[PDB]
Amino acid sequence: RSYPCDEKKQNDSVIAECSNRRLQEVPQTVGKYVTELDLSDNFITHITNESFQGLQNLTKINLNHNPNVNGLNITDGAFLNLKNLRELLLEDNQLPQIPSGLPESLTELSLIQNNIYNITKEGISRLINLKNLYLAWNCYFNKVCEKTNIEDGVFETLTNLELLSLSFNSLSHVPPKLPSSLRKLFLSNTQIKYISEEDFKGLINLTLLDLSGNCPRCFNAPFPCVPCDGGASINIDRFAFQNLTQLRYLNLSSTSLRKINAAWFKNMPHLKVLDLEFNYLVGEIASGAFLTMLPRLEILDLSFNYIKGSYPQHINISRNFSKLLSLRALHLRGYVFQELREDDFQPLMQLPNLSTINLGINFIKQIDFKLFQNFSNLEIIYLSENRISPLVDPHSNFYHFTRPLIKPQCAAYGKALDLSLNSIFFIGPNQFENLPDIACLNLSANSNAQVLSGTEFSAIPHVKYLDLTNNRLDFDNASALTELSDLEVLDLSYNSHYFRIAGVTHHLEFIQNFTNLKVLNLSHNNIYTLTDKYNLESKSLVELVFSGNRLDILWNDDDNRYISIFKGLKNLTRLDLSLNRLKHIPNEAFLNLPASLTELHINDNMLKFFNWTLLQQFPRLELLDLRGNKLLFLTDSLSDFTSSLRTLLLSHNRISHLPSGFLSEVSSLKHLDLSSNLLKTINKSALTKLSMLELHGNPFECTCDIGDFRRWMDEHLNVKIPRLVDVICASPGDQRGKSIVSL
Amino acid sequence: SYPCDEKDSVIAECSNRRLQEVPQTVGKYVTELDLSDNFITHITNESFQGLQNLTKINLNHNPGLNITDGAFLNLKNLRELLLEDNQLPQIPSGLPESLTELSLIQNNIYNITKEGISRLINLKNLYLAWNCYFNKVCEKTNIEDGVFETLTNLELLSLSFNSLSHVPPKLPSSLRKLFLSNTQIKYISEEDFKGLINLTLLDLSGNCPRCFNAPFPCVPCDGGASINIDRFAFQNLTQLRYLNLSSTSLRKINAAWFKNMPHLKVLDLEFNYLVGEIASGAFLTMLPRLEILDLSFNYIKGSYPQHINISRNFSKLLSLRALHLRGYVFQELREDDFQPLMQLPNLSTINLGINFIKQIDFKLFQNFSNLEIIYLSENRISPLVKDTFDPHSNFYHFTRPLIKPQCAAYGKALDLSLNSIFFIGPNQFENLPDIACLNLSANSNAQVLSGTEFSAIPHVKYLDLTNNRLDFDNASALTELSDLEVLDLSYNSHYFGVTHHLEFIQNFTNLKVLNLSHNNIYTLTDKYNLESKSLVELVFSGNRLDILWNDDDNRYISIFKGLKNLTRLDLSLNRLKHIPNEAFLNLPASLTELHINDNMLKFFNWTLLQQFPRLELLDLRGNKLLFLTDSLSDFTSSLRTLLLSHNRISHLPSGFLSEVSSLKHLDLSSNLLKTINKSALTKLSMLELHGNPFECTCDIGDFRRWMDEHLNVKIPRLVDVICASPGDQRGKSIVSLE
């Protein structure tokens, strides 16, 4: 049972996770099998060559973010002793120089987020084995350095280096004498404004070059941002990329480009991905000679090139876009225009493999929707934040938004259409005319107040994942959404009436009509009364999310009206009743929770009482989540009540005592969470296939009655007890603040 | 006193004290007993023995309630009895004839018997709303023939939210205000409102309602049928000021209805079907004295027409003060469409909210000589780039001011919140009247403020830009509005770790109030101070002072140091663990009021308050403070209001109150006191101790006596000043012991 680290198997070797653990030195209590040690995000101040003796087998050390709340003192030669150290991470250590005397065995080295202004032969030219060197965020609006000093030739002895990052450093010019072995060179945000024919000569293996953020489009710029003198673009020579025949990824985002020279791409037959955002390329997009040089481009990003001051009627697409045969995905966010006609997109209609058109953030008023019918492979039409009306971390892509445009779970069903954040205030009769067969539709946040009658989706009848969240939809009618007989996922989260005065009544009869509806999300609808029918009914449904509603009212109704709301959900396995303000649940109401349940969530309510006997009604229940409540006690024999429960979550409650023979002999129960409660000790009498037990944030009384518990922690090494550091003695005050393991 | 808080009359507040019976510990004086929101179950005639000079009793919201025969009869000076939310089956028998106002709202009273109320001849104001509705039970409210005709001094009768089906016969001529909203009447005969010549207000709303997209359950009349109202219904109603026909599903309005009614002042037609009537509008000629007209939410379902068709007969509305046209829904507003309103000499509010209007020929608001309030929220104006629940509430009318008073007070106010102005167009404000108060809130507006955008309306004094994505890192930003006094930039952030440059503030000659809450400000470029000689209030909540002041090179020790006229600073929600001692001392010594609440403060240097000689109010709530001096007097003598709610203070000196003198309000609620010392015990007027784990034996009784000794020092919420230890005591009020 490791301390303070969490050791464990990783593939075919053993790993010590020792982070966010307030340590002030390296531990010497580390397992002897460990080959990779993460000590990051801690209060460690000094490293000497003593700090990692008896761990010669180490391969990977991470000392990132040390310390938290001067710098990190690394005594020269501190690691030379580690003959198998391949990867060494030293980010955010406030270093003032590359550590002296680093071990030749290294292959990956990160020195990001330091105050290293000097790249010497003294520091790195001895590491002939480096593949991956990362030096970014080292001189970035640091008043000293005025400029990064790159000792000449420092890099040429690195004859096996494949990755060099120097982004967010003031370099003014490209370092000379870079090794032939490079495949990826990152020079983003380096105030490199001119690029010569010499700069990238002898890099015949380059697959990636990043020159983004030089001559920034510093307008609309979140961060500190010095645009070049005038409005000037980065200046890239005519033959700058001539010997770069392997280039696959080129990023020229935010280089203020107005024109694009087609000659840059004459010897680049494999360019796969080209980022051109935050530039001024509206003219170029209309003509675009360079589009003829890119038959293999798979991703083009031209987002946010809009002209300041302008909201022009139409977009203008070069016919040359048709010369983009390999194109998978086009990103045109924030060009900004009013009307999209069938004709404007003719070039793209032939491109065989085009699956993503991203047209977010253009404030487009009208789209001639029939155009999308002419694409044999659209999977993702993304029109968020437009104005359609009704019809009648330094390791992150800094400039191109990387997360999925549309949730996987939605997109997975088929064609995806995202009309979130438009002006669709009611669903017009012609709203979805001429649309291809949409499987996944997003109307979220349209101030949309439709009274659903079963006729509004008929033109796209096969939607399977509908997201309607954050509108004002009236689904009082029991015919509502029935025209979509294949619907599998409906999200009504955050739907209210166009007033948010309380008191709104709901009719939920439409639910029963669906024959393969699987997941329904009624969260935050502030549901306190159902009118006429008082039960939910569906043979299909599997998941119901009832969070953020007033079950509290519903279930204390004088007349027992809703004692059976969720019983007629006959196949349900997952029910979330969190955030419903519950103090006490009517024993009758709980016994009508449908017995098909596997996962019940009642967390974040105000329960003082929970009747454990009722879990006999639930022979297939595996996960009970009761966190964030006020409960005071537990049954003294849980095994009696259920023998199917695997996971029980009691963190953030008021429980002070663990009953005798409680854990004995539930057996069923693998994971039990008791953290953040009021336990002071754990009795000899309370002392199973339990494989994890959470106890952090409980005020303990060490010493001495606690000793029982300890020898239990030693004879049961199988019972993993996470987060030991945060299992803290409350008292006596001489122990206070210690782990209960310190003794 | 206990348990009532008691203060030409005398009011005992016994609201919300979890009382289970009418206290007998009630000062004989008391003429107003408020017992609402409690656990009271029975009211016998024992309950108000020797409380014989009571004027008013509230018993609302208890807890149904078992009130005995003639239980209130004893009380000869009782005028006002409120009995709302008491689950009563029937009106109480034996109510005192002295009553002048009764309320029986939210009960189960399905029968209006003479037995119950006909002997209450001094009644002036009767309320029986919300009793029979949405329940089986009763099928209909049984109202005894002639029950009201003996209440000849009755002025207001409210039966709203009951099922009546027809208006009650035999109503007393003295009625001035009859309320019949949501009562299920669908026809109004000539005879129903007969002889009621003193009526100033009639409410018939929710009768044949416009149900579809109504919040609460709602039932349109069979078919699409409106309420049917005889031609003459209102013939002998010449005195009416208020007519409420909201949600009556009206298509056609009979101008004859208003022949005899030349003083109607407020007409409400929200939630009807009157797009046709707004167009023709014969009834509009019968309203010379009308001041507030409301045609809101009459949109035709399906439709989103180009234009709004406004009858010329709108110009026969010479007394109109405020017109409400929300939810009409139309794409474009032409200058020509609002001609009829341009000669109305006293029109000051046009309300066009929630119409989804794409365009507005703005120059049209120049031909109106009294417009103070143009409210255009939730429309779709775009950047311009070209030259030329509670019973007693109003269900259908938006009661609250359309624009914050503080803004409108400066003059002509334009609200364009929740529109589509993503950047400020070059001609955005051309052809506007001289505008003092502007709301541009919630427009996804990403404009780069360069000091030229606002020049067409340069006399703006109040400007609201909250919930946008503005860039004001240029020092010229907004400086074209030299008369600017209030500027709100709360919840502005970059669209996607953003620098801020806050030099623009300094340029303003006359800027009173700057709000930058929730701007996640962690760094300032170039200049590290904020400078101004005008600014009186800065709000800096929801920013990252914690970063700026844990700054390794001390660049921000004097951020606010230069706001020389500052009296109110708000550093709430700044995640401040610690304040650097000197940085604290560099807060404008002009301060009257300092808020450092809802941070994470473990220590607070109580000495640095000698430096703040004007300080009246200090707010430290919701932190982690472990202790306090002990000698507050030494450190300041101006402090009137100290707020310590929600800290970890376990000791209370003991040199506190001996002597601070200056202090009028000390708030120690939700701390960790176990007791108040004997050494711990000259004027102060409110003390807040509830929420502490008090140790209830056998001291402190000294505090118990010190409460008796010092009666002046009001302590609120006694009932929640709770013994944590030891059960027995656990859960009792410290005033109960011996």
Ligand SMILES: *[C@@H]1O[C@H](CO)[C@@H](O[C@@H]2O[C@H](CO)[C@@H](O[C@@H]3O[C@H](CO[C@H]4O[C@H](CO)[C@@H](O)[C@H](O)[C@@H]4O)[C@@H](O)[C@H](O[C@H]4O[C@H](CO)[C@@H](O)[C@H](O)[C@@H]4O)[C@@H]3O)[C@H](O)[C@H]2NC(C)=O)[C@H](O)[C@H]1NC(C)=O
């Ligand atoms: C309305 O309510 C619905 C239904 O609850 C919500 O939609 C669900 O949202 C949840 C989370 O909010 C989703 O659950 C997550 O699915 C992710 C995708 O999993 C894929 O890969 C995994 C692993 O390889 C497979 O098991 C899986 O089948 C998928 O192939 C997971 O990445 C998430 O992981 C969770 O656990 C891990 C630990 O294992 C943690 O790191 C995470 O924190 C996390 O909890 C998770 O399981 C679910 O997929 C959604 N379903 C649907 C149908 O959309 C909506 O969010 C809600 N609406 C609103 C407005 O809130």
Ligand SMILES: *[C@@H]1O[C@H](CO)[C@@H](O[C@@H]2O[C@H](CO)[C@@H](O[C@@H]3O[C@H](CO)[C@@H](O)[C@H](O[C@H]4O[C@H](CO)[C@@H](O)[C@H](O)[C@@H]4O)[C@@H]3O)[C@H](O)[C@H]2NC(C)=O)[C@H](O)[C@H]1NC(C)=O
């Ligand atoms: C200019 O464009 C180029 C692309 O042409 C772009 O380069 C990309 O940089 C990102 C960010 O560094 C890389 O993505 C990472 O790849 C590394 C190695 O595979 C991973 O370590 C990263 O994963 C970490 O972070 C992830 C979340 O971001 C986590 O999932 C995970 O836990 C990791 O901790 C991440 O996957 C990417 O490899 C390159 N692209 C290529 C082809 O090499 C560059 O960023 C752009 N420049 C700027 C300033 O935007």
Ligand SMILES: *[C@@H]1O[C@H](CO)[C@@H](O[C@@H]2O[C@H](CO)[C@@H](O[C@@H]3O[C@H](CO[C@H]4O[C@H](CO)[C@@H](O)[C@H](O)[C@@H]4O)[C@@H](O)[C@H](O)[C@@H]3O)[C@H](O)[C@H]2NC(C)=O)[C@H](O)[C@H]1NC(C)=O
């Ligand atoms: C139909 O339209 C009618 C036209 O207004 C609505 O009648 C109004 O109903 C509301 C809700 O109950 C009443 O609100 C009450 O007003 C009185 C006011 O008393 C005085 O004191 C205040 C103090 O400042 C002052 O502002 C006023 O001018 C008064 O002189 C209060 O006792 C209540 O707290 C509450 O504010 C309106 O008073 C009433 N108007 C009139 C003229 O009687 C009616 O609500 C509409 N129907 C529906 C269903 O909404």
Ligand SMILES: *[C@@H]1O[C@H](CO)[C@@H](O[C@@H]2O[C@H](CO)[C@@H](O[C@@H]3O[C@H](CO[C@H]4O[C@H](CO)[C@@H](O)[C@H](O)[C@@H]4O)[C@@H](O)[C@H](O)[C@@H]3O)[C@H](O)[C@H]2NC(C)=O)[C@H](O)[C@H]1NC(C)=O
């Ligand atoms: C950004 O910061 C602004 C400045 O703090 C916020 O504006 C202030 O908002 C508060 C409420 O948060 C207002 O204070 C209230 O005003 C009312 C009005 O009282 C009336 O009667 C009193 C009698 O003394 C008179 O003095 C007033 O002038 C009014 O006639 C009070 O009744 C309340 O109790 C309370 O004091 C401020 O007035 C208001 N200031 C301004 C300039 O508007 C603003 O809300 C913040 N913005 C955001 C988005 O959070």
Ligand SMILES: *[C@@H]1O[C@H](CO)[C@@H](O[C@@H]2O[C@H](CO)[C@@H](O)[C@H](O)[C@H]2NC(C)=O)[C@H](O)[C@H]1NC(C)=O
């Ligand atoms: C529908 O569109 C909305 C609006 O963009 C998406 O909501 C975002 O969801 C992501 C990931 O779930 C959140 O981190 C953001 O907070 C949301 N943004 C906003 C503005 O609310 C939503 O995910 C979309 N639905 C689907 C199925 O993809």
Ligand SMILES: *[C@@H]1O[C@H](CO)[C@@H](O[C@@H]2O[C@H](CO)[C@@H](O)[C@H](O)[C@H]2NC(C)=O)[C@H](O)[C@H]1NC(C)=O
């Ligand atoms: C500008 O318009 C916004 C949007 O309507 C107003 O925001 C409201 O502010 C009040 C009180 O501060 C809140 O109770 C409401 O919830 C807000 N509404 C919304 C939709 O956010 C704001 O009051 C307006 N500003 C001025 C100066 O009048």
Ligand SMILES: Cc1cc(-c2ccnc3cc(Cl)ccc23)ccc1O
């Ligand atoms: C992507 C995007 C672009 C713009 C925008 C469009 C046109 N002209 C501008 C001028 C200025 Cl000074 C600032 C922004 C704009 C506004 C909002 C937005 O979300």
Ligand SMILES: Cc1cc(-c2ccnc3cc(Cl)ccc23)ccc1O
């Ligand atoms: C004022 C307002 C009006 C509308 C609206 C307009 C036109 N036709 C409709 C048809 C239906 Cl079923 C529902 C709503 C409408 C929607 C939202 C809103 O706030």
Ligand SMILES: *[C@@H]1O[C@H](CO)[C@@H](O)[C@H](O)[C@H]1NC(C)=O
């Ligand atoms: C399109 O995708 C297929 C499947 O991967 C690929 O084999 C094909 O070569 C691609 N077509 C073009 C024109 O690049």
Ligand SMILES: *[C@@H]1O[C@H](CO)[C@@H](O)[C@H](O)[C@H]1NC(C)=O
């Ligand atoms: C219920 O859904 C579960 C999936 O959770 C599935 O295994 C079972 O077949 C379904 N049965 C019915 C009748 O829907």
Ligand SMILES: *[C@@H]1O[C@H](CO)[C@@H](O)[C@H](O)[C@H]1NC(C)=O
């Ligand atoms: C707990 O449930 C059992 C039925 O399993 C019932 O007899 C008992 O009344 C319940 N306990 C409480 C306190 O309601």
Ligand SMILES: *[C@@H]1O[C@H](CO)[C@@H](O)[C@H](O)[C@H]1NC(C)=O
């Ligand atoms: C400072 O504020 C006070 C108090 O409102 C005001 O009287 C004075 O005129 C202000 N100073 C300036 C320079 O405007």
